[PDB]
Amino acid sequence: DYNLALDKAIQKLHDEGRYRTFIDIEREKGAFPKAQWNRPDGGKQDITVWCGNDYLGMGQHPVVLAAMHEALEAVGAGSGGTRNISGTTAYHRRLEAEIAGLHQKEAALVFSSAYNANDATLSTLRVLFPGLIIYSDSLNHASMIEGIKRNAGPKRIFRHNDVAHLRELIAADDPAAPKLIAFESVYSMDGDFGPIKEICDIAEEFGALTYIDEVHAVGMYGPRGAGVAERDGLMHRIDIFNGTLAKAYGVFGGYIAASARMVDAVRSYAPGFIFSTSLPPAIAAGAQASIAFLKTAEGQKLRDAQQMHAKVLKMRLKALGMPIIDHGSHIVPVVIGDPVHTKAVSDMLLSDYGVYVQPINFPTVPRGTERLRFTPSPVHDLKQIDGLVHAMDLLW
Amino acid sequence: MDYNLALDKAIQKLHDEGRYRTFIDIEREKGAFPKAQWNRPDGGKQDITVWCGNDYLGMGQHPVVLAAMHEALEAVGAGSGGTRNISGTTAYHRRLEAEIAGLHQKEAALVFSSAYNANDATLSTLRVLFPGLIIYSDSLNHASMIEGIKRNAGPKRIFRHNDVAHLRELIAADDPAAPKLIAFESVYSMDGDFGPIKEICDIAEEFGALTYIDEVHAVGMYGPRGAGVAERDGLMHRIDIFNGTLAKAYGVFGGYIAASARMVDAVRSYAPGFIFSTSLPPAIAAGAQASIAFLKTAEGQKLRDAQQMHAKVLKMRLKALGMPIIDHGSHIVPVVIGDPVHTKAVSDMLLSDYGVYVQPINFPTVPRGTERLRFTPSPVHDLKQIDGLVHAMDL
Numbered sequence: 030d031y032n033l034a035l036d037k038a039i040q041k042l043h044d045e046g047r048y049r050t051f052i053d054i055e056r057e058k059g060a061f062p063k064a065q066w067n068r069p070d071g072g073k074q075d076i077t078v079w080c081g082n083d084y085l086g087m088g089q090h091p092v093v094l095a096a097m098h099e100a101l102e103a104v105g106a107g108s109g110g111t112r113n114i115s116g117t118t119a120y121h122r123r124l125e126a127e128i129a130g131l132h133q134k135e136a137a138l139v140f141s142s143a144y145n146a147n148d149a150t151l152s153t154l155r156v157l158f159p160g161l162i163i164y165s166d167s168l169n170h171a172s173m174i175e176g177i178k179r180n181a182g183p184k185r186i187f188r189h190n191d192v193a194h195l196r197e198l199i200a201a202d203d204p205a206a207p208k209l210i211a212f213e214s215v216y217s218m219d220g221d222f223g224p225i226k227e228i229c230d231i232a233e234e235f236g237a238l239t240y241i242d243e244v245h246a247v248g249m250y251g252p253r254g255a256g257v258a259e260r261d262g263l264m265h266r267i268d269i270f271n272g273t274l275a276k277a278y279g280v281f282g283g284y285i286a287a288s289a290r291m292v293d294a295v296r297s298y299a300p301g302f303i304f305s306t307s308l309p310p311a312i313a314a315g316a317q318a319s320i321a322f323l324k325t326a327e328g329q330k331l332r333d334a335q336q337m338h339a340k341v342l343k344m345r346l347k348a349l350g351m352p353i354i355d356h357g358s359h360i361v362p363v364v365i366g367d368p369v370h371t372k373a374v375s376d377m378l379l380s381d382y383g384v385y386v387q388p389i390n391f392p393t394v395p396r397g398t399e400r401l402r403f404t405p406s407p408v409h410d411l412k413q414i415d416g417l418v419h420a421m422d423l424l425w
Numbered sequence: 426m427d428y429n430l431a432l433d434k435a436i437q438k439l440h441d442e443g444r445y446r447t448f449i450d451i452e453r454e455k456g457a458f459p460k461a462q463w464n465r466p467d468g469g470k471q472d473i474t475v476w477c478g479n480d481y482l483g484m485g486q487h488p489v490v491l492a493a494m495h496e497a498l499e500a501v502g503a504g505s506g507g508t509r510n511i512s513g514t515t516a517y518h519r520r521l522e523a524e525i526a527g528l529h530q531k532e533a534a535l536v537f538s539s540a541y542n543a544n545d546a547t548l549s550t551l552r553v554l555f556p557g558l559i560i561y562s563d564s565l566n567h568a569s570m571i572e573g574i575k576r577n578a579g580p581k582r583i584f585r586h587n588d589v590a591h592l593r594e595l596i597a598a599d600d601p602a603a604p605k606l607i608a609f610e611s612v613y614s615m616d617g618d619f620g621p622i623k624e625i626c627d628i629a630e631e632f633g634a635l636t637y638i639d640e641v642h643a644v645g646m647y648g649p650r651g652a653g654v655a656e657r658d659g660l661m662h663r664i665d666i667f668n669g670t671l672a673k674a675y676g677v678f679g680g681y682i683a684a685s686a687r688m689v690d691a692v693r694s695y696a697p698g699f700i701f702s703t704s705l706p707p708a709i710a711a712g713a714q715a716s717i718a719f720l721k722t723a724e725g726q727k728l729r730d731a732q733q734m735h736a737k738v739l740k741m742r743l744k745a746l747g748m749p750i751i752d753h754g755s756h757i758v759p760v761v762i763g764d765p766v767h768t769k770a771v772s773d774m775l776l777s778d779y780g781v782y783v784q785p786i787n788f789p790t791v792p793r794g795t796e797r798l799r800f801t802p803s804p805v806h807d808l809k810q811i812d813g814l815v816h817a818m819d820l
């Protein structure tokens with residue numbers, strides 16, 4: 030009985046308090062962070078989005094949108110093919126060039142998403158480097174874990190940010206074996222930073238490749254938004270960059286950036302790259318325009334505003350005695366530690382106060398660390414922050 | 426070790442085997458499909474005609490699709506801003522999933538970033554949901570299905586292409602108590618052949634297996650509403666899960682599954698490929714939904730009718746010339762050349778000489794001796810430009 034099995038699988042989620050109820054919204058372009066909440070009763074309510082990943086409000090930026098509207102009128106809705114069969118366009122090459130330039134790399138490769146970029150690249154690296162041992166941070170994103178486990182091969186999990194542990198593991202292994210160390214610059218849920226310099230030092234000592242996921246940093250850190258490696262001057266020490274175009278860049282898609290050899294090899298061997306339709310030209314146009322804008326001094330102004338708003342939100346919430354985990358990033362987690370109560374707090378914030386902060390539970394965060402994750406942006410002014418705080422105070 | 430050498434060996438190996446692929450850089454001209462501008466590697470520019478694309482019905486330039494995308498951009502902006510869980514669920518995703526559910530006459534549907542991701546995520550997650558699942562896979566199944574089936578560990582059985590006897594024999598041999606799923610396609614892209622849907626459902630029914638069908642090369646193009654080959658044959662009720670794309674005949678981007686509400690709820694609740702990636706941009710979802718609804722109407726029927734005639738016309742005209750055609754009754758037109766040098770020489774010729782863009786297909790993508798050009802005639806390929814292509818293909 031297939032239906033019984035499905036019923037059991039679903040019940041297990043309810044029993045663990047982690048069954049997820051999605052909130053149907055429509056963000057109001059030109060008025061971010063405002064959205065219309067399409068309620069389950071059929072009603073419509075204005076809300077403030079407080080948990081999204083469009084960190085800099087680039088989703089409503091006129092230069093991004095102008096580029097997208099233009100592309101649609103020039104070449105139409107989609108590419109109509111894979112990169113190999115009619116789906117390689119000028120918009121794809123120009124995008125890849127912008128990305129490569131962002132990370133000061135020879136080349137770059139766009140995928141349908143950063144999830145796909147990670148999963149396809151990490152798994153294909155095992156094929157390209159027979160015997161590859163992948164060393165992975167215990168809190169690495171699912172896309173990386175999935176790519177690492179995908180093709181059979183050695184993996185070693187190191188304790189989160191624990192470079193002494195990483196060293197212990199790498200030193201125990203066959204020195205002749207090829208090696209790659211996979212980690213993040215900014216971890217999505219805690220909002221803490223990866224120890225990029227120390228990992229690069231280990232990698233040089235043990236002759237390993239470095240693979241960094243900067244998905245939660247691109248657009249937001251460094252003087253041109255190239256990420257935390259750019260902020261800290263370590264870009265040249267990273268072999269492969271993984272990033273997304275769907276978060277601070279405000280559009281959709283993902284990428285790797287690396288040497289021309291690395292990129293040419295991955296694109297020639299990765300099934301996830303080869304056997305899927307290329308990104309729509311309009312998406313590629315918008316993303317490129319977003320990347321280019323964020324490399325400028327005008328882009329720096331949005332980063333400065335984000336950091337200032339994040340700082341202020343954190344002050345205000347600490348002032349209440351909220352349990353906020355503050356690692357110094359733009360991410361503002363409030364840990365509840367129970368999946369059911371996290372949903373209850375989130376539900377009451379939404380329905381009674383028009384504050385939308387999705388409850389975050391397993392498998393996105395470890396069991397018992399369920400939380401609300403605030404993502405203050407340049408469009409969340411000091412008055413919105415005030416309004417949120419007040420709602421949180423009233424709610425306790 | 427020496428990483429750059431290892432990369433060099435990987436690349437050089439493709440060059441040695443003649444299978445290093447050179448991307449051609451094109452920009453299709455909206456309002457003038459199949460026309461495009463070729464950005465040549467020597468720096469030159471030239472107009473060409475696209476003859477090997479998967480935007481089969483010209484929906485990529487349809488005014489209703491584009492209207493919906495421009496509106497959505499202005500209403501809600503460039504992307505969703507999150508995963509389906511974290512702020513990325515919009516009325517655009519919901520209405521899209523409702524339209525797809527309705528197309529396949531299922532309780533629900535689930536959209537992914539692509540059909541590649543839908544297949545990969547779904548087939549791998551089903552092993553989790555149905556402990557001990559054995560998956561019976563057609564030997565010519567798409568990469569995405571193969572990758573989903575191998576992703577998570579568990580039993581698999583590859584049956585020889587379209588060989589229902591081989592499938593029977595494999596399934597009757599297995600543990601009768603084991604959960605079972607049979608994965609296949611309605612239309613296989615390279616040869617353009619049809620899967621024997623009715624006879625695979627018969628076996629599924631006899632042995633208590635689930636049926637999983639990839640209708641990527643049939644959705645939009647077959648059945649009275651473009652729901653696929655299972656719709657055309659009246660078998661949609663006997664399929665448990667449909668896989669489809671929004672990127673080919675629908676002219677946009679994305680993919681889906683369509684199944685019962687329990688199936689969809691389980692997959693969306695368990696598949697990391699669904700959970701941990703940004704939802705489709707609402708403009709893409711608006712465009713895809715508009716394309717689908719349009720292709721369910723009589724006006725969409727006219728597009729399918731036209732495609733079918735053009736395909737029929739190209740095949741006859743090439744056969745009348747004495748050319749070797751792998752003809753299985755579909756919209757796909759594979760012309761056989763039998764050697765990789767002569768295949769590339771004909772596509773380089775067609776492109777350079779007449780502006781006809783058709784990619785060559787050699788080993789390992791098809792066997793040695795089956796090397797061919799795959800033509801994808803569309804309603805925008807009028808009777809006059811088919812005439813041009815026939816006359817060009819007089820060596």
Ligand SMILES: *Cc1c(COP(=O)(O)O)cnc(C)c1O
Nearest residue numbers: 305306539540541567641670672
């Ligand atoms: C092209 C193709 C896919 C993948 O669809 P995308 O939406 O481009 O990822 C899946 N299955 C088959 C049979 C295909 O041909």
Ligand SMILES: *Cc1c(COP(=O)(O)O)cnc(C)c1O
Nearest residue numbers: 142143144170244273275702703
């Ligand atoms: C969301 C996320 C991804 C995947 O990004 P998409 O572009 O949405 O697939 C990859 N890595 C991290 C750390 C992420 O948070």
Ligand SMILES: [Cl-]
Nearest residue numbers: 182183184185
């Ligand atoms: Cl091992």
